[PDB]
Amino acid sequence: HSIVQQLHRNSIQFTDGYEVKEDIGVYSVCKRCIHKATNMEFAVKIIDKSKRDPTEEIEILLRYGQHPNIITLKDVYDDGKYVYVVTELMKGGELLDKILRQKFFSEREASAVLFTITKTVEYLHAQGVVHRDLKPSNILYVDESGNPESIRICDFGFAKQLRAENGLLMTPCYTANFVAPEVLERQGYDAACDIWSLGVLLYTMLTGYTPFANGPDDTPEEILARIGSGKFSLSGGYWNSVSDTAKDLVSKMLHVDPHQRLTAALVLRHPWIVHWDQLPQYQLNRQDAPHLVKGAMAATYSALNRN
Numbered sequence: 001h002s003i004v005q006q007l008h009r010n011s012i013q014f015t016d017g018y019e020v021k022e023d024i025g026v027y028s029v030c031k032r033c034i035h036k037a038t039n040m041e042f043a044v045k046i047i048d049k050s051k052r053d054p055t056e057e058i059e060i061l062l063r064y065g066q067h068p069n070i071i072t073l074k075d076v077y078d079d080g081k082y083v084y085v086v087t088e089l090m091k092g093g094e095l096l097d098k099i100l101r102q103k104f105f106s107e108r109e110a111s112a113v114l115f116t117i118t119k120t121v122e123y124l125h126a127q128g129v130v131h132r133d134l135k136p137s138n139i140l141y142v143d144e145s146g147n148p149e150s151i152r153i154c155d156f157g158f159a160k161q162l163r164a165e166n167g168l169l170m171t172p173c174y175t176a177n178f179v180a181p182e183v184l185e186r187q188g189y190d191a192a193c194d195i196w197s198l199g200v201l202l203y204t205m206l207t208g209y210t211p212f213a214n215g216p217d218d219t220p221e222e223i224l225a226r227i228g229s230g231k232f233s234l235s236g237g238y239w240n241s242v243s244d245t246a247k248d249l250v251s252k253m254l255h256v257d258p259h260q261r262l263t264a265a266l267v268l269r270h271p272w273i274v275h276w277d278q279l280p281q282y283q284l285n286r287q288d289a290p291h292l293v294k295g296a297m298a299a300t301y302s303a304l305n306r307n
């Protein structure tokens, strides 16, 4: 029965030092705001306490915000009814959106982008944290520098830390403590779902289209059907100028069975991430239809989270 501190109705009000502006994103309420003191751009996430408890997420942001590739928390408030998670704004747009519009995008470049991301996911996992919503629309650029250092994993709304039955936070390594079985199980599947979403990312980065969807009109049943089959083509036209190490890595990360699927750690050991200096550099023969992909991607996760 320790104190949280995250439960705080202090004096200063959020809208007392911040000026709200237009909306942002596309299931969590977000808006752009300005610091009424330094006039700097910030992103704020408003949450209804009556509809959800954000304590879990807020803490994850605090203890793991320092990570360069994790959206940084800059401030937070609680007016009693809502909670104002003030983080840094993303002016670089969605990472996938930008990359899919770069005709001269190579594997060596795509391999660097994924390396940076997985490196972040590995750390999170190592500290007993899973995202459980690691879709491409939640991976963005902080600025338009174009470099991987400006990559940010965002929206830890559905994130969950690992802890024993009594409440102690433990890492996937430390086992001495007593943790519920189904919990240790769910924490294993969740960590696999993240890697799978990264497989969806790499897939789209290479080809130019979504693996389990063609457009925003595909029926939920046919998509889930493709997802349940564990079958995906890697010998199409767009798959001609693609190395086998890529095709291989892409099949491993997307392995239908979670157990046989690679973990963040293993992914980083794959020769496609390790021997990146061997990878090709000539532009990838891809499909140019980022808007359609954005529709297909949304249709995919829409069916997934249908339940």
Ligand SMILES: *[C@@H](c1cccc(C(=O)c2c[nH]c3ncccc23)c1)[C@H](C#N)C(N)=O
Pocket (backbone or CB within 6 Å): 024, 025, 026, 028, 029, 030, 031, 043, 044, 045, 087, 088, 089, 090, 091, 093, 094, 137, 138, 140, 154, 155, 156, 157
């Ligand atoms: C909402 C949310 C919260 C905090 C910051 C952002 C953000 O910076 C952002 C995401 N997509 C954007 N596109 C253009 C400008 C800024 C963008 C967004 C929600 C959560 N959590 C989310 N989409 O991440």
Ligand code: NA
Pocket (backbone or CB within 6 Å): 065, 066, 067, 068, 069, 070, 071, 072
């Ligand atoms: Na950060």
